[PDB]
Write an enzyme that holds these catalytic residues in place. Structure first.
Site, PDB file in Angstrom:
ATOM      1  N   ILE A  26      -1.225   7.457  10.981  1.00  0.00           N
ATOM      2  CA  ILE A  26      -1.859   6.797  12.140  1.00  0.00           C
ATOM      3  C   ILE A  26      -1.599   5.310  12.371  1.00  0.00           C
ATOM      4  O   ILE A  26      -1.625   4.870  13.508  1.00  0.00           O
ATOM      5  CB  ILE A  26      -3.380   7.095  12.290  1.00  0.00           C
ATOM      6  CG1 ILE A  26      -4.189   6.448  11.151  1.00  0.00           C
ATOM      7  CG2 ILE A  26      -3.630   8.594  12.446  1.00  0.00           C
ATOM      8  CD1 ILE A  26      -5.639   6.869  11.108  1.00  0.00           C
ATOM      9  N   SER A  28      -0.980   1.026  10.236  1.00  0.00           N
ATOM     10  CA  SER A  28      -0.933   0.225   9.013  1.00  0.00           C
ATOM     11  C   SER A  28      -1.994  -0.855   8.987  1.00  0.00           C
ATOM     12  O   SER A  28      -2.173  -1.584   9.969  1.00  0.00           O
ATOM     13  CB  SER A  28       0.446  -0.399   8.813  1.00  0.00           C
ATOM     14  OG  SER A  28       1.262   0.439   8.022  1.00  0.00           O
ATOM     15  N   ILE A  33      -0.173   2.118   4.331  1.00  0.00           N
ATOM     16  CA  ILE A  33      -0.167   3.115   5.393  1.00  0.00           C
ATOM     17  C   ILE A  33      -1.546   3.803   5.371  1.00  0.00           C
ATOM     18  O   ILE A  33      -2.311   3.657   4.420  1.00  0.00           O
ATOM     19  CB  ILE A  33       1.052   4.128   5.341  1.00  0.00           C
ATOM     20  CG1 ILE A  33       0.930   5.280   6.443  1.00  0.00           C
ATOM     21  CG2 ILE A  33       1.261   4.637   3.917  1.00  0.00           C
ATOM     22  CD1 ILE A  33       2.171   6.080   6.904  1.00  0.00           C
ATOM     23  N   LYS A  49      -6.802   5.112   3.671  1.00  0.00           N
ATOM     24  CA  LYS A  49      -5.850   4.008   3.580  1.00  0.00           C
ATOM     25  C   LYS A  49      -5.215   3.926   2.202  1.00  0.00           C
ATOM     26  O   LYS A  49      -5.821   3.413   1.261  1.00  0.00           O
ATOM     27  CB  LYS A  49      -6.577   2.694   3.909  1.00  0.00           C
ATOM     28  CG  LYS A  49      -5.763   1.419   3.727  1.00  0.00           C
ATOM     29  CD  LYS A  49      -6.390   0.267   4.500  1.00  0.00           C
ATOM     30  CE  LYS A  49      -5.631  -1.042   4.318  1.00  0.00           C
ATOM     31  NZ  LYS A  49      -6.214  -2.228   5.026  1.00  0.00           N
ATOM     32  N   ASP A 145      -8.063 -12.180  11.645  1.00  0.00           N
ATOM     33  CA  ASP A 145      -7.014 -11.442  12.377  1.00  0.00           C
ATOM     34  C   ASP A 145      -7.529 -10.538  13.490  1.00  0.00           C
ATOM     35  O   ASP A 145      -7.035  -9.432  13.666  1.00  0.00           O
ATOM     36  CB  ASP A 145      -6.147 -10.634  11.402  1.00  0.00           C
ATOM     37  CG  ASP A 145      -4.768 -10.274  11.968  1.00  0.00           C
ATOM     38  OD1 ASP A 145      -4.174 -11.047  12.772  1.00  0.00           O
ATOM     39  OD2 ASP A 145      -4.275  -9.199  11.569  1.00  0.00           O
TER      40      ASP A 145
END
Lengths: 355, 10
Positions: A26, A28, A33, A49, A145
């Site tokens: 799906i 990163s 991944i 994850k 972020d």
């Protein structure tokens, strides 16, 4: 016969509890991944994850520790939820891979940004992000972020912040780690950061939502700065003084700009019908954009300030907004040096702590 | 102003 097991997804191997099945790929995270998976037990979709030998590196180690810590300690309607964690390796000796299982939402913003939302919707989502961010701040953590990819939605119109690998407290003390189009001035120009750095991020998202495409492109890390000033115009001298003298020079050398008024960067044309009741006006949204998208970090609105802005606070609810800070074990203070070994062991402890 | 409950990822 065994508790875990493996599926090859392309070239990457996921080794996971028999409960999790039908992995699709799906996206990163900062690290790892990530697969969508069906969790047969709880009978619901989940997201997983894989974090590959994180202690391979101060970074991967550090960023991993963070996520683990922060995925457990944080609990909130608007932050993505920890469901489960594990390693398959049955001994510190053997150890390499961590897996984090967390809630799976319907989509990220990409996405929503394309469609033409109406004020309530925008203002709401906004509100949610914010409260989410508020919650993280309320324990000193700065996300760093925020971008469409880190924000997730569901069709019951709800929203969650996500990905903590990058999160910490104030800067400076690596420059190009946060996504280009979303970098605040203080990060483009390497001045270091306070919480309201996240507010910069917000402004770009809101703007992008409205604009239909990225707010300040930037063909490379330096170009980026033109885009900002192309649009918002050359910041005051009083600001430049804050700049480190080397960069300070270049900037003073950039051509001057007046930059557009917000009414021009964001005209009415761009907005839904002005709302059923007040506060929810094109112009009010604009006003708030104009208090977030502000080069000078010290002249910039705070989460709480934003939470009060007429355009946001119509949804304001103290039970959500004024929730207990996530208590962080001071054992950790998110940025001290360590070695492969001490790293590997911290993770494993923390992971084994969590199984 | 009622909170929304639907969002169209059509």
């Amino acid at each position: 016969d065994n508790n875990f097991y493996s599926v090859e997804i392309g070239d990457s191997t996921f080794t996971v509890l028999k409960r999790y099945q039908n992995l699709k790929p799906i996206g990163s995270g900062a690290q790892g991944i990530v697969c969508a998976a069906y969790d047969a037990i709880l009978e619901r979709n989940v997201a997983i994850k894989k974090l590959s030998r994180p202690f391979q590196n101060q970074t991967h180690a550090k960023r991993a520790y963070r996520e683990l810590v922060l995925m457990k300690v944080v609990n909130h309607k608007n932050i993505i939820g920890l469901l489960n964690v594990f390693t398959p390796q049955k001994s510190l000796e053997e150890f390499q891979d961590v897996y984090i299982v967390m809630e799976l939402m319907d989509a990220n913003l990409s996405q929503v940004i394309q469609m033409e939302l109406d004020h309530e919707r925008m203002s709401y989502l906004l509100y949610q992000m914010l409260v989410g961010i508020k919650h993280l701040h309320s324990a000193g953590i700065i996300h760093r972020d925020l971008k469409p990819s880190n924000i997730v939605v569901k069709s019951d119109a709800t929203l969650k912040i996500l990905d903590f690998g990058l999160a910490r407290t104030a800067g400076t003390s690596t420059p190009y780690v946060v996504t280009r189009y979303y970098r605040a001035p203080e990060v483009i120009l390497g001045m270091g950061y306070k919480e309201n750095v996240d507010i910069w991020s917000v402004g770009c998202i809101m703007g992008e939502m409205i604009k239909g495409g990225v707010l300040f492109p930037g063909t490379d890390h330096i170009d980026q700065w033109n885009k900002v000033i192309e649009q918002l115009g050359t910041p005051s001298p009083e600001f430049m003084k804050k700049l480190q003298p080397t960069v300070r020079t270049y900037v003073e050398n950039r051509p001057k700009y007046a930059g557009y008024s917000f009414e021009k960067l964001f005209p009415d044309v761009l907005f839904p019908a002005d709302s059923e009741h007040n506060k929810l006006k094109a112009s009010q949204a604009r006003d708030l954009l104009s208090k977030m998208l502000v080069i000078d970090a010290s002249k910039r609105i705070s989460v709480d300030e934003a939470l009060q802005h007429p355009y946001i606070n119509v949804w304001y609810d103290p039970s959500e907004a004024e929730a207990p800070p996530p208590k962080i074990p001071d054992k950790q203070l998110d940025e001290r040096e360590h070695t492969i070994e001490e790293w590997k062991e911290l993770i494993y402890k923390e992971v084994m702590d969590l199984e | 102003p009622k909170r929304p409950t639907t969002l169209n990822l059509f």
